[PDB]
Design a protein around this ligand. Structure first.
Ligand SMILES: N#Cc1ccc2[nH]cc(CCCCN3CCN(c4ccc5oc(C(N)=O)cc5c4)CC3)c2c1
Ligand SMILES: [Cl-]
Ligand code: NA
Ligand code: NA
Lengths: 541, 118, 110
């Protein structure tokens, strides 16, 4: 009855870095970087990383390595009353599996369609393009008027998404069968990557987490060699210290770092719960976080060296080219850039392969975190049939992802992307931090870390765990709850009932912790004071 | 206003060739397919081929793959169509039509008056 | 290469009676929600004047009389009560596939 330790330390390191670096690093980081300063956004980014990001990452890595019980059942040794964090994380994982794998299916569809001598998003001659189409890079003879479109945007919104057949979340109509097949392939790959446990998932990661870096290096070389990349990099790094004063830039930096490291999802607990007890978690936490941050920086460089090239081609400012916010920056913008590259039909393939692989390992990590939590919590029914319950998890994830594959499924992608994993995960991480620091002793936790590694964490880590880190998490959550979003994917301003539905998604994930607190308080006997005292201390079997 | 004008009638010699042109105006010709359809006397329409000026892409039916070749000229806004090995079967009226955009069902909105080769 | 067959090759419809012309595509002409099937009308010795596009949308400068319906593989061109000035030949063209093909044609007459 021993845990299946990692085959090598490199297995754990590569798994964690593959989890941390995801599709968000590619479109979200450069986007939020230029929107809030450029090189002036790198001062708040690193400050938030040092003060709130690394502490949580390291804390939960050490916690998982010491208690080594996953997410649901690890609270039996920290603070039993907070066992609802595991179920909240399970629900959040359900939503993330609903939308993330659909995005990966879009990437796979692009990769499959990019096996032709002429890429299908180059001209408007196709049968999906409308009368608003005009070549993006053609001469000024064809002006952009006020409502002109580009071949790649129509390829993305009328052929791949078929968003034009749906008129919002009101009629989430039909289902693209091509995207269904693509997501089925994605899910079979996912299942066969993690079905046997960590032994096989640590060896699949060897490629799935290192291949994106090779593709990023080649793409960066190409973008640097492009004419006009200097515009892009200069617009990416040119600091705007005036933008620093507003609290919005710091808010965005803190949120970006927290969601990039991805603590509080129960997956770092699952990963750290496998490597040896005496393994060094401080060093690997530091190196993994540094690698993740540098990867975000280099991915932003890759994106902007091409954004500036495209802006130079049209003789326009780089600001007028990057207004594409989310995945449109990769499926419309970078697709247009690739279509005009000299050796096209090869950069498209590697670009979409990097996208699919760097999403594939974040999916592996999340699903493995959920699986580890459930297996640890219920070893009497599961943990004998490791093959099973991963088939069930993948099947339910696919079923929940079916609504995201409909014709109006990109709207659901964006609704889940903003509300699922919103103030729900942030509150979960805050509750975990308070449960490990305040409720569970901090002197006790540092004693555990000392017994595990060999030295007690320094005063900086202690202060960050106690006050600064939960304070920053609360500052991020308070930011989100004040501003209601104004989602707008493709000329579709979302309705108010959609905002209410998103708030309901947020409530559903977080309506596990309070209900479990109430249930646990009811179950235990004695007066209220002793009822909470008993429910607060670890069981200590 | 969109109007397509094409050359006048020609003569059909066995084993000869002709050069039927279709000047276009009133729209951005470089973003619409330019179809050709044959009309035998006393018969129905018969699609011949396609051409997309701006890209040069051309499609043909399974009867004119070698008989007819389409060409475009972005300077003069004219689309040509060369016919080779003129038999008495291909003496007909060739119309130069202009397809709509993909969303409009590629409907051939505007037609030329038709060039009769006899 | 989708073969289109127009069942009523001849319409002897009198004034005031609507004329129904059918089309039959071997394969489905629909794609991205747009039935790729236009209807044309050709007077004796005149270029084919477009009538319907997308099998349902009205042409340009065409009377409301001419109405197209149907989706998938079966399409119709239900011409509201006919009159003397529209006794022509109506063709059924599909614009889905590498090679677009016309229909057999359907002459109409009193
Ligand atoms: N299948 C599966 C599965 C299951 C369970 C799982 N747990 C974890 C995963 C990893 C998959 C990616 C999920 N991340 C991507 C980024 N995203 C994000 C980034 C930056 C941001 O910055 C701001 C701001 N307001 O500035 C807002 C904001 C939001 C948050 C969610 C997983 C996958
Ligand atoms: Cl990042
Ligand atoms: Na990331
Ligand atoms: Na990833």
């Amino acid at each position: 009855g021993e845990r299946e330790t990692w085959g090598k330390k490199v297995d754990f390191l590569l798994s964690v870095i593959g989890y941390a670096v995801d599709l968000g690093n590619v479109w979200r980081f450069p986007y939020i970087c230029y929107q809030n300063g450029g090189g002036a956004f790198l001062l708040p980014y690193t400050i938030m990383a040092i003060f709130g990001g690394i502490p949580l990452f390291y804390m939960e890595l050490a916690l998982g390595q010491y208690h080594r019980n996953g997410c649901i059942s690890i609270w039996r040794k920290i603070c039993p009353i907070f066992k609802g964090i595991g179920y909240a994380i399970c629900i959040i994982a359900f939503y993330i599996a609903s939308y993330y794998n659909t995005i990966m299916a879009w990437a796979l569809y692009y990769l499959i369609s990019s096996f032709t001598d002429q890429l299908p998003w180059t001209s408007c001659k196709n049968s999906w393009n409308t009368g608003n189409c005009t070549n993006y890079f053609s001469e000024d003879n064809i002006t952009w008027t006020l409502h002109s479109t580009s071949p790649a945007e129509e390829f993305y919104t009328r052929h791949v998404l078929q968003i034009h057949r749906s008129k919002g979340l009101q009629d989430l109509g039909g289902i693209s069968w091509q995207l269904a097949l693509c997501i089925m392939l994605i899910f079979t790959v996912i299942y066969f990557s993690i079905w046997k446990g960590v032994k096989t998932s640590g060896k699949v990661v060897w490629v799935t987490a290192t291949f994106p870096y090779i593709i990023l290096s080649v793409l960066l070389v190409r973008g640097a060699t492009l004419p006009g990349a200097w515009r892009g990099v200069l617009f990416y790094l040119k600091p705007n210290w005036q933008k620093l004063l507003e609290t919005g830039v710091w808010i965005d930096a803190a949120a970006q770092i927290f969601f990039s490291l991805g603590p509080g999802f129960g997956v770092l607990l699952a990963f750290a719960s496998y490597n040896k007890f005496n393994n060094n978690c401080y060093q690997d936490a530091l190196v993994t976080s540094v690698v993740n941050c540098m990867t975000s920086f280099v991915s932003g460089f890759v994106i902007f060296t091409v954004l500036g090239y495209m802006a130079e081609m049209r003789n326009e400012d780089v600001s007028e080219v990057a207004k594409d916010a989310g995945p449109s920056l990769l499926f419309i913008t970078y697709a247009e850039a690739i279509a005009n590259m000299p050796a096209s039909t090869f950069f498209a393939i590697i670009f979409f392969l990097m996208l699919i692989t760097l999403g594939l390992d974040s999916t592996f990590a999340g699903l493995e975190g959920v699986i580890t939590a459930v297996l640890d919590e219920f070893p009497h029914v599961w943990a004998k049939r490791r093959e099973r319950f991963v088939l069930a998890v993948v099947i339910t994830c696919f079923f929940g992802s079916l609504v995201t594959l409909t014709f109006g499924g990109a709207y659901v992608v964006k609704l889940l992307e903003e509300y699922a994993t919103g103030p729900a995960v942030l509150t979960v991480a805050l509750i975990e931090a308070v449960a490990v620091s305040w409720f569970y002793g901090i002197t006790q936790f540092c004693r555990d870390v000392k017994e595990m590694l060999g030295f007690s964490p320094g005063w900086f880590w202690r202060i960050c765990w106690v006050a600064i880190s939960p304070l920053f998490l609360l500052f991020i959550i308070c930011s989100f709850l004040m501003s209601p979003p104004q989602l707008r994917l493709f000329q579709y301003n979302y309705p108010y009932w959609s905002i209410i539905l998103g708030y309901c998604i947020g409530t559903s994930s977080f309506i596990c912790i309070p209900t479990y607190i109430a249930y646990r308080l009811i179950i235990t006997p004695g007066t209220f004071k002793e009822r909470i005292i008993k429910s607060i201390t670890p069981e200590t079997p | 206003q969109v109007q397509l004008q094409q050359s006048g009638p020609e003569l059909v010699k066995l084993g000869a060739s002709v050069r039927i042109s279709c000047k276009a105006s009133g729209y951005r010709f470089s973003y619409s397919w330019m179809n050709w359809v044959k009309q035998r006397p006393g018969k129905g329409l018969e699609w011949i081929g396609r051409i997309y000026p701006g890209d040069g892409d051309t499609k043909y039916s399974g009867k004119f793959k070698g008989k007819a070749t389409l060409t475009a000229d972005k300077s003069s806004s004219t689309v040509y169509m060369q016919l080779s090995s003129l038999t008495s079967e291909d003496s007909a009226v060739y119309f130069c039509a202009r397809s709509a955009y993909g969303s409009e069902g590629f409907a051939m909105d505007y037609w030329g008056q038709g060039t009769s080769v006899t | 290469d989708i073969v289109l067959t127009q069942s009523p090759a001849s319409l002897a419809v009198s004034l005031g009676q609507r004329a129904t012309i059918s089309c039959r595509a071997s394969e489905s002409v629909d794609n991205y929600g747009i039935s790729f099937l236009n209807w044309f009308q050709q007077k004796p010795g005149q270029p084919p004047k477009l009538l319907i596009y997308a099998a349902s949308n009205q042409g340009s400068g065409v009377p409301a009389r001419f109405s197209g319906s149907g989706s998938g593989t079966y399409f119709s061109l239900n011409i509201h009560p006919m009159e003397e000035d529209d006794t022509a030949v109506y063709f059924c063209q599909q614009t889905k596939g590498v090679s677009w093909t016309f229909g057999g044609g359907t002459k109409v007459e009193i």
